[PDB]
Amino acid sequence: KKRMEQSRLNKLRGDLDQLIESDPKLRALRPHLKIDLVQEGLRIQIIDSQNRPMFKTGSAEVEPYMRDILRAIAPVLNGIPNRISLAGHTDDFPYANGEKGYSNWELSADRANASRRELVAGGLDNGKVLRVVGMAATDAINRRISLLVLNKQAEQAILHENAESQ
Amino acid sequence: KKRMEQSRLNKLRGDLDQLIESDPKLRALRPHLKIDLVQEGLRIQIIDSQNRPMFKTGSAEVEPYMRDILRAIAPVLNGIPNRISLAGHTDDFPYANGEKGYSNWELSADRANASRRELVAGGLDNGKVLRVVGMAATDAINRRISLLVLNKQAEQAILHENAESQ
């Protein structure tokens, strides 16, 4: 039912918790790792701040700790068949320097894909990611990578909203 | 109610239809322009094929006709306050040449943003686009740009699924 699925998600939640609490490097970054259940499934948020950035300035290049986080969780996410929506949220000051129209919009999507490639390098099955998302609004700095492990319902709703058919 | 909103969407649909049928260039591309009502709002699909590509090969650079389409509809979309989810769908053969991990995933998101910038150049109010999406699967070539004018419900569901809060 929606039962075997919820059970899988709860187990995944526990496995991620076990992984984080058994790794010194992850324990040190815990405040920047948020896990919760949302309508569409299990959500994992990785906070990207000025004090502890997950990417190099104005770049989609991951920082050491971001690489450690993504590669560490990749194998665990692979445990279940649920697919994932990966979102890059970049509410920061106007992108400066190198830019042929390149703004926080391009930066947010690029970071989302940069995170996707790290998960894959870490062992995430290709195909697991169903979509990447970018969101950027014009001490209000808010940057983060969201990894949503979708329940069947949400996955289907996305596939229907994205098909050419009616 | 959901009434004033549906009426606005139906009016928008009619205005887009009027625009397309009054422009020679758009009439010529009509088969590649699909408009319909979906659960989340009004959807506009722009088909990107081998016979009539909307982007240069392996690039997020728009082709003339794509520029004409996007700049033409931009002012019309600006008529209502509803925001938009812009998606790039790229189901094509493995991306060749220039690539430091650059695949159809990066290409799909880049094309989505390239389309976003054209709408803005064409007069679309900044902020109107709520998110950009990229989707790329591993004569099955299927490429398209989807522009979803979101009804309040869908917009709120997106904002709740993307907030840090619970």
Describe this structure in words.
It is classed as membrane protein. The entry lists the keywords 2-layer sandwich, Bacterial flagellum, Cell projection, Chemotaxis, Flagellar rotation, Inner membrane, Membrane, Transmembrane, membrane protein. The structure is a homodimer of 166-residue chains. Chain A is α+β, with helices and mostly antiparallel strands. Chain A has helices at 2-22, 24-29, 64-77, 104-121, 152-162; strands at residues 33-38, 41-47, 84-91, 129-135, 142-150. The first copy, chain A, is built from five helices and five strands. In chain A, a hairpin with a 2-residue loop joins strand 1 (33-38) and strand 2. Chain A has a five-stranded mixed β-sheet with strand order 1-2-5-3-4. In chain A, helix 1 (2-22) packs antiparallel against helix 3 (64-77) and helix 3 (64-77) crosses helix 4. Chains A and B meet through strand 1, helix 4, strand 4, strand 5 and helix 5 of A and strand 1, helix 4, strand 4, strand 5 and helix 5 of B.
